[PDB]
Amino acid sequence: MTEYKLVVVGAGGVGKSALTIQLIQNHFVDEYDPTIEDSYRKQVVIDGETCLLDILDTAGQEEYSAMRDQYMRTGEGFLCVFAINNTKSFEDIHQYREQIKRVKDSDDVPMVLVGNKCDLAARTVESRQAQDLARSYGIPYIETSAKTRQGVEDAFYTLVREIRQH
Ligand SMILES: Nc1nc2c(ncn2[C@@H]2O[C@H](COP(=O)(O)OP(=O)(O)NP(=O)(O)O)[C@@H](O)[C@H]2O)c(=O)[nH]1
Ligand SMILES: [Mg+2]
């Protein structure tokens, strides 16, 4: 069956792992558990297609940049995640996108911009600003909560649909 290699990137603590674990294991992880590199494989049916999602969960910490680059190289699509209460993680998106472009030698790779932690009332990044950034890159913007599961399937399934249209 078709295998889609999806890579989840973004600053430390934005919820990359929580989103992935919500998808795969149906539970919200509330603990402090920094990732080095983890990979998940799950068989799913998306729009009637049987496919294997191979999800590569990366570290947000800059010490692991080399390893992150190796993994980004094999990826077919990327989830670029920031948190809606963390303005620095939003600013850092440009830098993760630029690295993806350099690693893939491409101006256009299937990607979705994800604004996570949308359950939180204390928002510092407005949906309007994120949407303007996404439009400037030519990619979809999805808001998610790993805590409530809002947007979780949408983010991953939208990415797969983008890979299908590349
Ligand atoms: N309220 C809320 N909290 C979240 C959400 N997603 C993650 N968190 C919390 O934020 C913290 C970090 O989440 P985690 O998934 O570990 O982030 P990460 O991006 O994978 N960090 P790293 O880059 O170190 O691997 C955890 O305490 C987690 O429970 C969310 O959608 N809403
Ligand atoms: Mg993590």
Residue numbers in the entry: 1 to 166
Q: Can I see the authors' text?
A:
Ras protein is a small GTPase involved in central regulatory processes such as cell differentiation, proliferation and apoptosis. It possesses multiple conformational states and acts as a molecular switch between an active, GTP-bound state, and an inactive, GDP-bound state, controlling essential signal transduction pathways. Two segments of Ras termed switch I and switch II correspond to the regions that exhibit large conformational changes upon transition from the GTP- to the GDP-bound state. Ras structure consists of a central β-sheet core (β1–β6) surrounded by a bundle of 5 α-helices (α1–α5).
